[PDB]
Homo-oligomer: A and B are copies of this chain.
Amino acid sequence: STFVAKDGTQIYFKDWGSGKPVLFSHGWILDADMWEYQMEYLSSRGYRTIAFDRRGFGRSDQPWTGNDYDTFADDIAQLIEHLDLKEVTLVGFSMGGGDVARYIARHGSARVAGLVLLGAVTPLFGQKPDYPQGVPLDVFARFKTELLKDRAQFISDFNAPFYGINKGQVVSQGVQTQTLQIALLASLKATVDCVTAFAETDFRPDMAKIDVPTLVIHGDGDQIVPFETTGKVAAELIKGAELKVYKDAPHGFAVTHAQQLNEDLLAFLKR
């Protein structure tokens, strides 16, 4: 399915099953397919599951402008409006944790039953004056330089630390092939602009606005989005949030810990 955002950007989404809705926001160089197993799992068990390709990614249009969290958050608002969703459980992975938090901050939580932040960049990923423990901006600047030289090889090399294959996690060649295939669908421009966005955007004000049940899940072996300065802090800053730590899990844990995640999502929805 598609809808057209305010600026004319066409956004691809899937809307499966019926019942209470669960809306998924994918990570960086991924698309809505990263959620296919969670969607099948929950839609076969009485839920409606919705997942979009972020602007610039997968099957969506690739606009030059609007590659920032405020626009990402408003794109989600438009999707929710378009389908007239109510009591939605928002689920964000990695950089996609930021647009679901920012949606709540910009639009409130009247339509929202709950929030799930999976290996998410919230509440803040990069360094700030009062957050020297964040990732230094020159680290991201280097990634951008590499992406602007050869993004295809960048993505290909990113598979190992993403899935923790370099630390003994086991992920098939098939999954690695699918990951690269999907990543190459994306815009070079959106790919690089998203680094800027997740490097620099501060979601600490957003955390104070989250007034729904919230589950934070993070792998403490995550090489991409460090657990200690992201998920651990998000769970403390969000009132009433629950935290689950998957021991030694990598960033790409929707793959390596698929069944555990499916069960945790179900348990949260049935709380």
Contacts and interface: CB of A to CB of B under 8 A. Distances in A.
Interface of A: 1, 14-17, 33, 36-37, 39-40, 43, 61-62, 64, 148-156, 172-175, 177-178, 180-181, 184, 187-189, 192, 258
A177 B189 contact: no
Given A16-B189, A61-B1, A37 B177 contact: no
A62 B149 CA distance: 31
Chain A residues touching B, majority SS:
helix
10 contacts: A16-B64, A36-B189, A40-B148, A149-B258, A150-B172, A150-B174, A153-B175, A154-B174, A177-B184, A178-B184
A124 to B, nearest CB: 26
A184 B153 CA distance: 19
Contacts of A178: 152, 184
A153 B181 contact: no
A260 to B, nearest CB: 13
The 5 closest A-B pairs by CB, nearest first: A152-B174, A153-B174, A153-B172, A16-B64, A36-B188
A177 B180 contact: yes
Contact of A188 (B37, B64, B177, B184): B37
Given A36-B189, A189-B16, A156 B184 contact: no
A178 B181 CA distance: 8
B150 A175 contact: yes
